[PDB]
Amino acid sequence: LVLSQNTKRESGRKVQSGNINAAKTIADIIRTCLGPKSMMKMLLDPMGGIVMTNDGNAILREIQVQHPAAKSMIEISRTQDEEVGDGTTSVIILAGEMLSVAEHFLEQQMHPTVVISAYRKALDDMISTLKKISIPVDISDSDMMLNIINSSITTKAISRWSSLACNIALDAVKMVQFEENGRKEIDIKKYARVEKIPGGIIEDSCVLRGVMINKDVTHPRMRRYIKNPRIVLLDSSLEYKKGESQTDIEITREEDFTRILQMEEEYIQQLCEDIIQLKPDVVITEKGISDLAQHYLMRANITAIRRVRKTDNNRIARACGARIVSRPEELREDDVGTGAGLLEIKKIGDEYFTFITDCKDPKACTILLRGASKEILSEVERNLQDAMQVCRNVLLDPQLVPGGGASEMAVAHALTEKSKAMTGVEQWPYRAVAQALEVIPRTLIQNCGASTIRLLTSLRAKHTQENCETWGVNGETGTLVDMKELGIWEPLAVKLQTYKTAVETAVLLLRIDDIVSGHKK
Amino acid sequence: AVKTLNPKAEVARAQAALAVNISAARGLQDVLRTNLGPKGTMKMLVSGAGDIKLTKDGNVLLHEMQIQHPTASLIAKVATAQDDITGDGTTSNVLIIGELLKQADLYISEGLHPRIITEGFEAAKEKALQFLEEVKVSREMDRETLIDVARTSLRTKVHAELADVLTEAVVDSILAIKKQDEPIDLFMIEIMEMKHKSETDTSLIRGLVLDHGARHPDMKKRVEDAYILTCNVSLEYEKTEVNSGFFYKSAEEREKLVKAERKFIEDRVKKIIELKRKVCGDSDKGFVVINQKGIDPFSLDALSKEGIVALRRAKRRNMERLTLACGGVALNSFDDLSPDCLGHAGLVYEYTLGEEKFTFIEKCNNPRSVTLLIKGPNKHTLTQIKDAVRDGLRAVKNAIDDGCVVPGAGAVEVAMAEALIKHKPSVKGRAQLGVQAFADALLIIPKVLAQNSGFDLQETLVKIQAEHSESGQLVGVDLNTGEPMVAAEVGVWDNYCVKKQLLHSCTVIATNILLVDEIMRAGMS
Amino acid sequence: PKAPGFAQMLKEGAKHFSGLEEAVYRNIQACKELAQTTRTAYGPNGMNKMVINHLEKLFVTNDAATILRELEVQHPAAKMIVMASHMQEQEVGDGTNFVLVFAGALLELAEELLRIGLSVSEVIEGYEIACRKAHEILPNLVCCSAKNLRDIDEVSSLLRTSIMSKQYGNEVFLAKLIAQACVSIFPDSGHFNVDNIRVCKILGSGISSSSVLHGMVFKKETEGDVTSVKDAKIAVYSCPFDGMITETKGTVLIKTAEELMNFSKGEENLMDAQVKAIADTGANVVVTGGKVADMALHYANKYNIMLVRLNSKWDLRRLCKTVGATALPRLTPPVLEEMGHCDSVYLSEVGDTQVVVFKHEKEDGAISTIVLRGSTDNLMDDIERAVDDGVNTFKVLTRDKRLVPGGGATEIELAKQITSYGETCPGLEQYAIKKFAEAFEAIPRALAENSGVKANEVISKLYAVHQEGNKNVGLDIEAEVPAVKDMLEAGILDTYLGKYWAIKLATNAAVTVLRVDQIIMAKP
């Protein structure tokens, strides 16, 4: 007994093949799921719930494994998803297939390092390739973005509802631009709140010029409908709060006890008049609310909400532009809840909701999702999440790529052009990666279900002519289609990290030679 | 495949899970189909805890029928949503669902790829809703109009007599509910139930009833004229929020400390009593108080010597109904006390039942909050009718909500069918198949209606499958002779949005349901 | 969760496979294992391997089939290819290695086209027709169709290749001795049946001291003396050497006294008379596996005759053939014409093992026996296995004709011929043949792997050197020059027939294994 006492170890080609095999599985289990003709998957969470979703990330984010590289592959999916959202429909399927041929030189007894060495060379040209075949686009033009978005969203079940989301995604995206960074304003998708409510229909869900609250007026006498209210964000509580120094009182005389009780009354009321002195209309706080003050604030006919979540308070603050306060005496009128086009609290059906509309030029907004069932809704927003995410990426770069595999073949021959001109042993890996690229349109064929081999050869044959690069594969006809008329258009950066991620996967798994278990720490 | 990845994992396959899911609903619809239709049978459930049901609304059944098949649980959710949307027809909704999927299966069983049929459904609903939109009957809020609709809905659950008794109360409530623009159904609707004397005598009370009584024998049980105190501030003792350790040195002070402690609440109650005495200088008038929190016995005694009715520990919503009842000004601070802040009632007594106490609010001049006091012979039945009640109300709220109305009893579905069957392949052809079954699936409602009614299905459908003339009518199936019927003439109706949402709900359910291939289960231990 | 549904509970616990997934994935991988299992196997540079059986028996091996025989593999298609070469080995001998290599390679690219979307059925046809074309083009590559029937030198140079492949160390000795064996055997029972060869295993006295005898051996004991007469007069009797007891229960009976004396007495004299009549024929040796009469041997020593014992039916069957003498189930009649005749018979001691020696000089042609000397019985079992393969390799040579160039060059020509034919196929299948054409590189690819040098340019120059008709030049055996060697002058040739079948056989295995799509497996 020597080493680690029942911790398994393995080395070399068996390890190499094993990682090769598992990824082949890993990619394979999803190859059905990309494309406008994709499939859509529903999952068992371990604790009983159901998630039905086409986006691969969550699928893999909902996958438990034992082999490591799969879990290693797992994070790669979620990372690009996190950074890019979609392509997760494709990136891993690219990834394993890259590995799938990547093995093919292992029997060639070629040391992987060079094979890596070519890869880093390969990606460099690839990035250079796409930059050459990218297309900048105006960002002010809405319709192309809408076209881009549907081009971006005509892959998920909301396909039937492209018009709504495209504008829906655009509107919220546009209205989030925080210019205090000079002209380096940055949008946020955490101020892009998403609210899913069942019932109703997709058509009923809409972008709200403001915020929605799953709470109610503390007191009936406060009005449930106001045009141009003033809103207060009291970070502090509204009631008497501990004297923090383990304070103590020793009364001796009778009136003292009754005196002090008024004093807390007095202390609370004190707070009330400080509030009213700014003539506010709406009271919001993350903590509780004294009803006795709430009597006072009722007495002032000033709308009040208690115990509201902080992020919403920020978005509420970002809705009406006011700034939150924890100090009623130090409350400042520059944070008057002005920027409020309409105040209301509707009844959704068994739930009051808070309706805050028509801010002048709001920066925060929540999207109201009104559908059939939350798992349906949750599926929707994931697609929405991707939809909005790519748009900001479009707002981050105006340069666009034609997808549909068109770009893929473009590099493919381009590397082939590189390949033949780059004589040496490394040449064969170089073309092989190009050989790897061709599968994605091919995969698209199967999801359509067409004669993949013939179409692919023709497409490559089609893309042998330099005059045409937008020739790609239609989702439904399964026919060669120039993209310009087809309009499936994509952010270049989306494809960059795609290949960037893809190749990173390759090298990382390739240097592996060994497995060690049972760390026990 | 991924079994390679995980041994303990479980996967299905495209062909496999597809059949499983359709098999799942096909079973699920089979059980529930007994119910919808007035002739249908409600079902009784027994908890593992031994509790008891007598229900018919499927959502209750689905929510309580312990099943594990996932699609059902998914279907359960939207059905619950529909319950949160309208309340009945969830019955039909699932019956719509599985039957569509069954008809859906027929074609894919012919190898048809489902993606095509979905689009057929997509087109199909559109034309249907297009028809659905135009065919709804714009109707005013005529008492009878809703009355029939209420009777239309309520018969789904209970005796013809029982709902008829129930029908009058709900509608008049509805009449006494609106501020002509916006109902919320929560405050003005009080649903309280007593195990008392009948099922039928369950009635609207023009006033309000409370779930508790006075805590003192000298407390007046009954008062002719009630002047109302709505409040929530505790008149129980309280000691201040700061650590405040006191001592004394004399037992005389100890008593002096006794009186001082009480003095604060002493003033509190004192403010009211003076107000009462400022208000009820007359002997005839009676003064009542309501607290959301509790009340000191000494305070109780304080009121007792003044013969003051007061109540403690009310649910946070009751005072709204109270304000919606007596126009009373619900307050916290009694220093700012005004007689105009008061509420007034024309009559109050208390009703003692069993061990509990129930309190009665009567004779608002213009009550805006009312109560569905439920008189009960049997606990489950109270629970049983209540669902029927809440269902019945939510029917009406949409019914008033929509200035239009759908004639019920599935006359629409044939109308849907004929119009939809009257659709050429203006579609790309292959979709006309899915449309055909989509239309085909729609006729289930009368089919099960006849089935639940026992009449032979195939012949009756053909019978009613006779649009008569230029007046090809909205013709229903008779629920007792299995014959063509004008639901409008006989006053059988339904909420348009009901018809609206259910189609939408089911359709979206359907397409995604057909659009899964394997059901994954690879979770942690 | 925790409760998926089954649309078909048809199975009480079993494995049903479907969706081509196993075919496209699981079927392939299992095959790929077999390639990986024996990729090292063939090669003069290919090294041996040992495995223990389930009954804990040692087996050092380079022959694939034998080690394959030691594997209880459980994948179904695994067995198919296993039994395929198994019969292939039953047919030709070495090549088992090769066909498995053919098997994996044919499989290996096959799913690729299958994964590329090529039709399984069309894959079958293209794989089929190409093989047929391969048969067509194969014969045109025969060179040096060695013909000399009964020379030692030719076949010695010939059979070495079989030896070298499965024994790279001791070719010269092993070549001559089987060549010694083959020339010693003439067409007698019909054209040198392999079974006409016997092998004896004797531990110790390393391989160089192993020998071959123009006679036959027995590692058994003796009863009287040990002599050789150059005119050996042998008696052969499948009958056990004793008085013929009736199979029926015939119990001797007596009635009076004088029976007893004469009873024992008479039995003695008759057996003596029995053996005497044998001795008068001059037969100085009697042989049987059967039960031996004790007084008979007592008499046998008295007339000084040799005895042979406990030989199984095969042993005497061999021995009968060796002396050409008819075995006699009848004890008495020492027929002149059916009587033994050997150059010399005796007992010797080798390796502390009693050895019955039939030293023979046979002009008519004899079923000879070979002497195995060396330390490790496992080596012997290996060494005989390779030794046997040459014999069959010889017999297959002895079948018709037509040595062809080994060392992969032929298959280099094949692929070129196939690939050149490939563009003349045209159609979606053109790739299928092209991939099948590509497949054969695995053998020299494996050769380089067992050579441990960079194959690819080795192929390339080999490809390059083959662009000029250089059909006889192929892969060298040298780390110093991992480039090329000319096989013909190297004499590294092989059977037309041997390659031909396996190719068709390997062809057959694939089309079969490729043929199935969805699978079912009842529980073991």
mmCIF file of N, CA and C in Angstrom, chain A residues 432-506:
data_model
loop_
_atom_site.group_PDB
_atom_site.id
_atom_site.type_symbol
_atom_site.label_atom_id
_atom_site.label_comp_id
_atom_site.label_asym_id
_atom_site.label_seq_id
_atom_site.Cartn_x
_atom_site.Cartn_y
_atom_site.Cartn_z
ATOM 1 N N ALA A 432 -7.796 19.382 -41.785
ATOM 2 C CA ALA A 432 -8.716 18.580 -40.994
ATOM 3 C C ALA A 432 -9.680 19.459 -40.218
ATOM 4 N N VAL A 433 -9.173 20.524 -39.607
ATOM 5 C CA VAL A 433 -10.058 21.435 -38.895
ATOM 6 C C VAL A 433 -11.045 22.056 -39.867
ATOM 7 N N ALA A 434 -10.553 22.458 -41.035
ATOM 8 C CA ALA A 434 -11.456 22.863 -42.099
ATOM 9 C C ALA A 434 -12.455 21.754 -42.378
ATOM 10 N N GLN A 435 -11.974 20.513 -42.434
ATOM 11 C CA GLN A 435 -12.890 19.390 -42.570
ATOM 12 C C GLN A 435 -13.893 19.373 -41.429
ATOM 13 N N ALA A 436 -13.462 19.756 -40.228
ATOM 14 C CA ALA A 436 -14.390 19.783 -39.106
ATOM 15 C C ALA A 436 -15.502 20.794 -39.326
ATOM 16 N N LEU A 437 -15.178 21.943 -39.914
ATOM 17 C CA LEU A 437 -16.145 23.028 -39.979
ATOM 18 C C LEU A 437 -17.396 22.634 -40.747
ATOM 19 N N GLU A 438 -17.256 21.748 -41.722
ATOM 20 C CA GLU A 438 -18.298 21.531 -42.710
ATOM 21 C C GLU A 438 -19.541 20.894 -42.116
ATOM 22 N N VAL A 439 -19.433 20.399 -40.890
ATOM 23 C CA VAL A 439 -20.522 19.612 -40.340
ATOM 24 C C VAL A 439 -21.734 20.456 -39.988
ATOM 25 N N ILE A 440 -21.537 21.707 -39.590
ATOM 26 C CA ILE A 440 -22.653 22.493 -39.074
ATOM 27 C C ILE A 440 -23.756 22.638 -40.109
ATOM 28 N N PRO A 441 -23.490 23.099 -41.331
ATOM 29 C CA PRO A 441 -24.548 23.042 -42.342
ATOM 30 C C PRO A 441 -25.019 21.625 -42.553
ATOM 31 N N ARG A 442 -24.082 20.679 -42.579
ATOM 32 C CA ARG A 442 -24.461 19.281 -42.676
ATOM 33 C C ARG A 442 -25.437 18.930 -41.570
ATOM 34 N N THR A 443 -25.088 19.257 -40.328
ATOM 35 C CA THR A 443 -26.017 19.024 -39.232
ATOM 36 C C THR A 443 -27.355 19.675 -39.519
ATOM 37 N N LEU A 444 -27.325 20.883 -40.075
ATOM 38 C CA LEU A 444 -28.562 21.551 -40.447
ATOM 39 C C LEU A 444 -29.362 20.702 -41.417
ATOM 40 N N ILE A 445 -28.678 19.973 -42.296
ATOM 41 C CA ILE A 445 -29.406 19.156 -43.257
ATOM 42 C C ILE A 445 -30.251 18.128 -42.526
ATOM 43 N N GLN A 446 -29.655 17.445 -41.552
ATOM 44 C CA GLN A 446 -30.368 16.378 -40.864
ATOM 45 C C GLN A 446 -31.567 16.930 -40.122
ATOM 46 N N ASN A 447 -31.383 18.058 -39.443
ATOM 47 C CA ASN A 447 -32.500 18.695 -38.767
ATOM 48 C C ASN A 447 -33.593 19.068 -39.755
ATOM 49 N N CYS A 448 -33.221 19.439 -40.976
ATOM 50 C CA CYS A 448 -34.203 19.461 -42.050
ATOM 51 C C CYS A 448 -34.511 18.046 -42.515
ATOM 52 N N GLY A 449 -33.475 17.237 -42.710
ATOM 53 C CA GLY A 449 -33.649 15.876 -43.171
ATOM 54 C C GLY A 449 -33.514 15.719 -44.672
ATOM 55 N N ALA A 450 -32.463 16.276 -45.268
ATOM 56 C CA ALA A 450 -32.289 16.254 -46.718
ATOM 57 C C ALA A 450 -31.044 15.454 -47.095
ATOM 58 N N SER A 451 -30.811 15.330 -48.402
ATOM 59 C CA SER A 451 -29.656 14.589 -48.902
ATOM 60 C C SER A 451 -28.406 15.382 -48.577
ATOM 61 N N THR A 452 -27.844 15.111 -47.404
ATOM 62 C CA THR A 452 -26.796 15.967 -46.867
ATOM 63 C C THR A 452 -25.554 15.943 -47.743
ATOM 64 N N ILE A 453 -25.126 14.752 -48.155
ATOM 65 C CA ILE A 453 -23.854 14.628 -48.853
ATOM 66 C C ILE A 453 -23.881 15.425 -50.146
ATOM 67 N N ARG A 454 -24.916 15.212 -50.955
ATOM 68 C CA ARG A 454 -24.996 15.886 -52.241
ATOM 69 C C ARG A 454 -25.053 17.389 -52.064
ATOM 70 N N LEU A 455 -25.921 17.852 -51.173
ATOM 71 C CA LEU A 455 -26.071 19.283 -50.977
ATOM 72 C C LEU A 455 -24.763 19.889 -50.498
ATOM 73 N N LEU A 456 -24.097 19.208 -49.567
ATOM 74 C CA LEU A 456 -22.853 19.727 -49.018
ATOM 75 C C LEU A 456 -21.783 19.844 -50.089
ATOM 76 N N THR A 457 -21.608 18.792 -50.885
ATOM 77 C CA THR A 457 -20.612 18.835 -51.943
ATOM 78 C C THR A 457 -20.895 19.985 -52.890
ATOM 79 N N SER A 458 -22.157 20.135 -53.284
ATOM 80 C CA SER A 458 -22.545 21.247 -54.135
ATOM 81 C C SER A 458 -22.286 22.577 -53.453
ATOM 82 N N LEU A 459 -22.628 22.683 -52.170
ATOM 83 C CA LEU A 459 -22.386 23.929 -51.457
ATOM 84 C C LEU A 459 -20.908 24.268 -51.466
ATOM 85 N N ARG A 460 -20.074 23.306 -51.086
ATOM 86 C CA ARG A 460 -18.642 23.495 -51.231
ATOM 87 C C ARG A 460 -18.312 23.832 -52.671
ATOM 88 N N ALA A 461 -18.875 23.065 -53.603
ATOM 89 C CA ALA A 461 -18.735 23.401 -55.010
ATOM 90 C C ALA A 461 -19.305 24.781 -55.291
ATOM 91 N N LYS A 462 -20.471 25.087 -54.720
ATOM 92 C CA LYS A 462 -21.011 26.433 -54.852
ATOM 93 C C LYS A 462 -20.042 27.455 -54.289
ATOM 94 N N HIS A 463 -19.462 27.172 -53.134
ATOM 95 C CA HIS A 463 -18.580 28.154 -52.533
ATOM 96 C C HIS A 463 -17.162 28.084 -53.078
ATOM 97 N N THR A 464 -16.885 27.189 -54.030
ATOM 98 C CA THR A 464 -15.607 27.267 -54.724
ATOM 99 C C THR A 464 -15.491 28.539 -55.543
ATOM 100 N N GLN A 465 -16.607 29.059 -56.042
ATOM 101 C CA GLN A 465 -16.589 30.322 -56.760
ATOM 102 C C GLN A 465 -16.413 31.467 -55.774
ATOM 103 N N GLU A 466 -15.397 32.295 -56.011
ATOM 104 C CA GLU A 466 -15.138 33.421 -55.123
ATOM 105 C C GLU A 466 -16.232 34.472 -55.210
ATOM 106 N N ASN A 467 -16.962 34.517 -56.323
ATOM 107 C CA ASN A 467 -17.892 35.613 -56.539
ATOM 108 C C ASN A 467 -19.013 35.629 -55.515
ATOM 109 N N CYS A 468 -19.236 34.523 -54.820
ATOM 110 C CA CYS A 468 -20.404 34.397 -53.968
ATOM 111 C C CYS A 468 -20.004 33.810 -52.627
ATOM 112 N N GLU A 469 -20.327 34.528 -51.556
ATOM 113 C CA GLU A 469 -20.013 34.081 -50.213
ATOM 114 C C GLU A 469 -21.233 33.977 -49.318
ATOM 115 N N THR A 470 -22.348 34.597 -49.690
ATOM 116 C CA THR A 470 -23.545 34.585 -48.866
ATOM 117 C C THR A 470 -24.390 33.353 -49.115
ATOM 118 N N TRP A 471 -23.915 32.444 -49.954
ATOM 119 C CA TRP A 471 -24.617 31.200 -50.213
ATOM 120 C C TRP A 471 -24.578 30.326 -48.972
ATOM 121 N N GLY A 472 -25.740 30.109 -48.370
ATOM 122 C CA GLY A 472 -25.841 29.247 -47.213
ATOM 123 C C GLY A 472 -26.965 28.247 -47.373
ATOM 124 N N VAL A 473 -27.353 27.593 -46.282
ATOM 125 C CA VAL A 473 -28.352 26.533 -46.316
ATOM 126 C C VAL A 473 -29.634 27.047 -45.685
ATOM 127 N N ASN A 474 -30.710 27.016 -46.459
ATOM 128 C CA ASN A 474 -32.014 27.373 -45.939
ATOM 129 C C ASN A 474 -32.421 26.404 -44.841
ATOM 130 N N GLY A 475 -33.102 26.934 -43.827
ATOM 131 C CA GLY A 475 -33.557 26.081 -42.747
ATOM 132 C C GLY A 475 -34.569 25.043 -43.196
ATOM 133 N N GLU A 476 -35.581 25.459 -43.955
ATOM 134 C CA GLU A 476 -36.727 24.596 -44.227
ATOM 135 C C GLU A 476 -36.654 23.901 -45.578
ATOM 136 N N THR A 477 -36.362 24.639 -46.650
ATOM 137 C CA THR A 477 -36.206 24.009 -47.956
ATOM 138 C C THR A 477 -35.035 23.049 -47.965
ATOM 139 N N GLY A 478 -34.044 23.291 -47.117
ATOM 140 C CA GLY A 478 -32.840 22.490 -47.188
ATOM 141 C C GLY A 478 -32.133 22.677 -48.508
ATOM 142 N N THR A 479 -32.154 23.891 -49.033
ATOM 143 C CA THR A 479 -31.548 24.184 -50.314
ATOM 144 C C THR A 479 -30.487 25.249 -50.127
ATOM 145 N N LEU A 480 -29.523 25.247 -51.038
ATOM 146 C CA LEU A 480 -28.516 26.293 -51.066
ATOM 147 C C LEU A 480 -29.181 27.638 -51.280
ATOM 148 N N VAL A 481 -28.845 28.604 -50.435
ATOM 149 C CA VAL A 481 -29.483 29.911 -50.478
ATOM 150 C C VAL A 481 -28.441 30.968 -50.170
ATOM 151 N N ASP A 482 -28.322 31.953 -51.045
ATOM 152 C CA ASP A 482 -27.568 33.134 -50.678
ATOM 153 C C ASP A 482 -28.263 33.824 -49.512
ATOM 154 N N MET A 483 -27.465 34.323 -48.573
ATOM 155 C CA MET A 483 -28.022 34.873 -47.344
ATOM 156 C C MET A 483 -28.679 36.229 -47.549
ATOM 157 N N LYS A 484 -28.199 37.008 -48.519
ATOM 158 C CA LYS A 484 -28.646 38.390 -48.651
ATOM 159 C C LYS A 484 -30.158 38.465 -48.753
ATOM 160 N N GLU A 485 -30.743 37.639 -49.612
ATOM 161 C CA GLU A 485 -32.192 37.545 -49.650
ATOM 162 C C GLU A 485 -32.736 36.792 -48.442
ATOM 163 N N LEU A 486 -32.016 35.776 -47.960
ATOM 164 C CA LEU A 486 -32.553 34.962 -46.875
ATOM 165 C C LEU A 486 -32.605 35.741 -45.568
ATOM 166 N N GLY A 487 -31.575 36.527 -45.281
ATOM 167 C CA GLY A 487 -31.642 37.425 -44.153
ATOM 168 C C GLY A 487 -31.346 36.820 -42.802
ATOM 169 N N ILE A 488 -30.931 35.557 -42.735
ATOM 170 C CA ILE A 488 -30.506 35.013 -41.452
ATOM 171 C C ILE A 488 -29.159 35.645 -41.144
ATOM 172 N N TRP A 489 -29.168 36.731 -40.388
ATOM 173 C CA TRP A 489 -27.952 37.485 -40.157
ATOM 174 C C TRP A 489 -27.605 37.494 -38.680
ATOM 175 N N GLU A 490 -26.308 37.577 -38.417
ATOM 176 C CA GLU A 490 -25.773 37.243 -37.114
ATOM 177 C C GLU A 490 -24.693 38.233 -36.723
ATOM 178 N N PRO A 491 -24.494 38.443 -35.427
ATOM 179 C CA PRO A 491 -23.373 39.274 -34.989
ATOM 180 C C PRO A 491 -22.059 38.544 -35.189
ATOM 181 N N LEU A 492 -21.088 39.270 -35.735
ATOM 182 C CA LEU A 492 -19.775 38.693 -35.982
ATOM 183 C C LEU A 492 -19.158 38.178 -34.691
ATOM 184 N N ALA A 493 -19.219 38.988 -33.632
ATOM 185 C CA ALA A 493 -18.653 38.587 -32.351
ATOM 186 C C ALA A 493 -19.260 37.288 -31.855
ATOM 187 N N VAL A 494 -20.541 37.058 -32.148
ATOM 188 C CA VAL A 494 -21.171 35.791 -31.795
ATOM 189 C C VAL A 494 -20.350 34.645 -32.357
ATOM 190 N N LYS A 495 -19.996 34.755 -33.630
ATOM 191 C CA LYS A 495 -19.233 33.695 -34.259
ATOM 192 C C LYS A 495 -17.791 33.667 -33.779
ATOM 193 N N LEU A 496 -17.252 34.812 -33.363
ATOM 194 C CA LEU A 496 -15.853 34.864 -32.954
ATOM 195 C C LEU A 496 -15.600 33.959 -31.759
ATOM 196 N N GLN A 497 -16.218 34.289 -30.624
ATOM 197 C CA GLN A 497 -16.075 33.459 -29.438
ATOM 198 C C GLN A 497 -16.488 32.030 -29.724
ATOM 199 N N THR A 498 -17.429 31.839 -30.643
ATOM 200 C CA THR A 498 -17.829 30.509 -31.062
ATOM 201 C C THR A 498 -16.594 29.720 -31.452
ATOM 202 N N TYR A 499 -15.898 30.193 -32.482
ATOM 203 C CA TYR A 499 -14.637 29.574 -32.857
ATOM 204 C C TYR A 499 -13.601 29.747 -31.770
ATOM 205 N N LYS A 500 -13.559 30.930 -31.157
ATOM 206 C CA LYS A 500 -12.635 31.129 -30.054
ATOM 207 C C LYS A 500 -12.852 30.053 -29.002
ATOM 208 N N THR A 501 -14.093 29.896 -28.537
ATOM 209 C CA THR A 501 -14.378 28.840 -27.571
ATOM 210 C C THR A 501 -14.080 27.467 -28.137
ATOM 211 N N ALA A 502 -14.495 27.224 -29.379
ATOM 212 C CA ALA A 502 -14.357 25.900 -29.965
ATOM 213 C C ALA A 502 -12.922 25.425 -29.879
ATOM 214 N N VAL A 503 -11.999 26.258 -30.342
ATOM 215 C CA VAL A 503 -10.614 25.834 -30.404
ATOM 216 C C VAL A 503 -10.023 25.722 -29.010
ATOM 217 N N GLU A 504 -10.403 26.621 -28.098
ATOM 218 C CA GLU A 504 -9.921 26.519 -26.727
ATOM 219 C C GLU A 504 -10.259 25.158 -26.155
ATOM 220 N N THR A 505 -11.482 24.700 -26.400
ATOM 221 C CA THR A 505 -11.860 23.357 -26.000
ATOM 222 C C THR A 505 -10.854 22.351 -26.519
ATOM 223 N N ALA A 506 -10.510 22.469 -27.799
ATOM 224 C CA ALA A 506 -9.672 21.462 -28.430
ATOM 225 C C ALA A 506 -8.352 21.315 -27.694
#
